[PDB]
């Protein structure tokens, strides 16, 4: 042991980990699908044709061909979410981690990775499913999948740059489970996606392709959700982006199928350069290259799906993060900065509002601006209602309104408003429980004793692994033994949520009502 | 400015509020000196008076002990008497706003002080805010506390207890027979209290007697039900004759015990007081409310189990830390000055203090169920607050509430959780019991008064609300896109927050915590 | 006490003797309470909790509380009806004529015999035919069971509510 299971395409090796005195198996980088190269950039992922012989997978594999977030050289709050492997065309593999002893016909869980479908790797060390595998018997598995330019180039109907390719590719990782987990004791039949950020609006998107409904069980969202306004793209500006980035590259052209012919031919280098420019102007949220209804993956505009009940029928667990918004702050908005405890003005809110919302009208600008400054004297004032706006619009309210059109199709949906800050977390007080840092919490990361989270912390984890687990297993995120705090379904009527803290979990109604009604009813007309 | 009581002429006093006037008519007598041969009696008719009565200067306070832990000390100063103690002490307030108003609705306030301590004339209590802001009539009175108010020789017409009770009642009628006479309406009366002030207010929907006095309530951390609040008649009786042996009154005639004690000075029996009981505690109300079969007709929580009380509407609330305050005056490590972190055996030491009667096991459950730690050094300084707070306050608080409104009636709860930023005590005593009261009262309102500007909206609020449900029967405040307001019903028990950021509905107050006191420990 | 629950802590104990000698003076007491404590705690009460949780995901759950001592029974009265003494009636040992059971028993066992079979064959313990009770649901609310004995067998709910609660709400936190 040397240890090797025979997946329907070869043999391979993982390899066994130390964890809390227990073993767990990793089978790390394993392809899923044929490199997508020269020839192949831009399509959907190519089937696996057999490899002979044992396939070695016992290091992270490349992550796929990004940006590099380089504005805090040296700060870990940052760059801990930069890859952490080397960038690659050549990038379609997955990890599997199998508690050991080889479990029999264990849960799987498939994690999906955020990044505005522009960044992000499953190597991440907020990612591993080491722990997860250990603890609640579970069989974790994790893919990448191509990002930016790379995997979701969209020129509608041409099969050369249909768009939605790394959801393909997430969606290949999933035929890859479905075929294959049962070898390593994973039930294929008891399968629950969860991601974060575009992670989360992915998972999304999965209950909504119907290539998609058999290949998975649950659903878990967290903070994401497609009715985002950052996650899909319209056709139209799918297409105006795809020529600008021809331009951009001397790649202009007359026949269609020729743009992607001179596109298939520059460097990965000198696509990751301009993806940043075929917007007019953009956001510390852009998403430059993102899914859209490509008539495949998704067949119709997904909102009218929702609306009307053509999805996956199954239980949903869905939540947000007390502070959204502020992690975005930093990348823009004037007067802020991770070292000053960013107090600004209102001549410096109506400035943060412009680059957040460069498009939209002057009257549109001053609604928000009006709605979110009726003052309860207080320095912070602006610098907190910019954060909410942020938080608001971009994430808790379409993650709301997507868990209530849901359940109204009458399924069981849960609800989280996650508002703990690790104290281990290097940016400062005042961006408060950031985008993102739930994370951890969920892999379990502060059950490593030698870790430095407190004692709140890691019974807190364990708290969220379990429900997590648990709902994983049954569809119903509880924690039966320690005497918690029973979570209550999601009505659309009462609208009931769970919150998540160190301290008292507590059960609330109607988040955020106020705000949301702004963003949901009123902001979609201006 | 005069008005005609039926039973004299009064002078009010005009004043300046908020760039408005308001008539102030302190000290207005309501029952004929209960001295000599009237002390531990039921207060006796007004016999009218001829010509006019100044009622320019709050009256006197009534006999009772005063709380010296912290000379100078405004947090525990602020509570102390301030007119001249006295025996002769039934005297009541009325603040009309101007000008005279025509129907408007009544408030009387009943003050605190585990039936042993308080007064109307505290600056706490001062009915001309809500005049100005509120156009509201308010009323308070001054009622015998102590022994001189409710010593209780059962059925015994000389000692027949519940004094103080009838005093607040003799002060009800005196408003329903005169407050028109100030434009006040008779027919629309809340009454509202707090501690001790809150457990009257409940004893008086008990009372068929004052069934007709007024017509709402309000019940500010208290009620009846609290461990505190009312004596069995067999207590009642070991302290009249404690009493009475402490002063040399021990006796044949029963009668002649009251003849002896009619004749020893005030403060010969104040001093004794302290020590009719084997043992006390911070909360000890030696002299209290009794089933006098009269006032009280049978014991109240039957009373309250079987639906025997006035049907109307009802505000009931607590405090964020009701139980701190008392920490100080004998929990071995609590002091106002240090921030008192204590020991696991200080901790079993508290409990000796406030649960001195009760069984070694009894104490364990106590110890048991708040010692389950979620490492942190303030734990058991928090548990022993909580311990307090729950049991002599939040869950009876709670539970009077929950079984009231099983009668078919409408209820509504908050929870106040805002620490005056001006609150003379340290940060660990947090949202103290009775330091609401300031923000009922809508002492925030007054400008230069260095409350916050948070602070400054909340009592708005408060004072709002608390007015509307005076007026129609509900605490909603309609017009500033407020939190509705939501009836507390006894299944799903929602309560509302009270607190200069957002006010939230929340479920269940202290549920894990109540059931232990509720079901639980009432059987050790 | 020490003896059946050895690790339990000493308070632990304490509440146990609390909630079971709260007497109604009678030389027994001590005697049946110790009984109970067992009864209750290993047998009645998570035999009705299981009842309990499972009927709430949907499904039909009848309830017994079987209350008859065999006359044949070799233990002293005092032990009463005990642990595993119907199984001898559920497998109809008292339908043998030349048994010397009584007839009250053998009729008992003729009645259980036919439920249980009946129970087997379509899921629902009825005895139909010589006028019986009806035996209902176990639902979560109001906790009906069935008595099960010579004389008449009664309908009644709630089977020891109040030591459960103990058993099942406070006991596993000591
Ligand atoms: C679609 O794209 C056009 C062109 O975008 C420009 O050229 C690209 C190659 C890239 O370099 C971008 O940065 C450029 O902006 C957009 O037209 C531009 O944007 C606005 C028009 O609203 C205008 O201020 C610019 O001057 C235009 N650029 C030029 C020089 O033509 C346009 O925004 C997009 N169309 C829509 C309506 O989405
Ligand atoms: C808060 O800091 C921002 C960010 O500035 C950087 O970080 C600071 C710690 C400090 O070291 C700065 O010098 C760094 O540049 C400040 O934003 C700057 O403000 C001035 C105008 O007021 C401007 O000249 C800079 O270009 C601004 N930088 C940007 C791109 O916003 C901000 O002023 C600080 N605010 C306060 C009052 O604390
Ligand atoms: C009722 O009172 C008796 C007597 O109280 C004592 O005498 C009073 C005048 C006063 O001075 C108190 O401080 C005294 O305690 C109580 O009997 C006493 O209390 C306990 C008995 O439980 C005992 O330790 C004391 O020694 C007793 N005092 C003496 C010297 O007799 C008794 O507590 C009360 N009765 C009940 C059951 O409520
Ligand atoms: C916290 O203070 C209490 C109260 O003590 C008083 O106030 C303090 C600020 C300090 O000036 C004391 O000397 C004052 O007496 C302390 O309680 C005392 O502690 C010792 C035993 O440890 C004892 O000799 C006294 O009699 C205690 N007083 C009483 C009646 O409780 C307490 O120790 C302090 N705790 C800490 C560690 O901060
Ligand atoms: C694969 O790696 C393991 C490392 O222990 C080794 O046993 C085996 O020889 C390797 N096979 C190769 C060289 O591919
Ligand atoms: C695993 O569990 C499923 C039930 O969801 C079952 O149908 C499948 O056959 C099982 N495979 C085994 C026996 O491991
Ligand atoms: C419950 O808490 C205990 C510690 O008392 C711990 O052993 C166990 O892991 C916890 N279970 C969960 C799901 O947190
Ligand atoms: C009562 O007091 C007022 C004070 O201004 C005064 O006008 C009046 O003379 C007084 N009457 C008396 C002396 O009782
Ligand atoms: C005062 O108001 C009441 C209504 O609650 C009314 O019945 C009473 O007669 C009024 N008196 C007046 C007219 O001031
Ligand atoms: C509502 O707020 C306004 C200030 O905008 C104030 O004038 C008014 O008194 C408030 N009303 C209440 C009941 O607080
Ligand atoms: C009903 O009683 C009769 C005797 O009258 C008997 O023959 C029959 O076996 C009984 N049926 C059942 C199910 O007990
Ligand atoms: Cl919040």
Redesign the interface.
Known sequence: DDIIIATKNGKVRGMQLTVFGGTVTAFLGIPYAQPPLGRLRFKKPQSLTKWSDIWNATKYANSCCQNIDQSFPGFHGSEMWNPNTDLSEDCLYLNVWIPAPKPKNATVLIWIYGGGFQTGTSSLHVYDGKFLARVERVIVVSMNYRVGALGFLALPGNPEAPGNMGLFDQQLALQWVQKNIAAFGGNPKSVTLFGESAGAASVSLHLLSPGSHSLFTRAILQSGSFNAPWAVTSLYEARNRTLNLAKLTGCSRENETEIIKCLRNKDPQEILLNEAFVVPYGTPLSVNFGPTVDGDFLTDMPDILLELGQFKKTQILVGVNKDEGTAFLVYGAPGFSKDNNSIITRKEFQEGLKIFFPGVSEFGKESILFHYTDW??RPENYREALGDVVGDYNFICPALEFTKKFSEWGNNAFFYYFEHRSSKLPWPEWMGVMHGYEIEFVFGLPLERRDNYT??EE?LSRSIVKRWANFAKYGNPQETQN?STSWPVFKSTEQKYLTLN??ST????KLRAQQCRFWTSFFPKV
Request: net charge positive.
């Open positions: 309860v004297q004692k709140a019974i005497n160190t301290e507590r059960i609330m109604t």
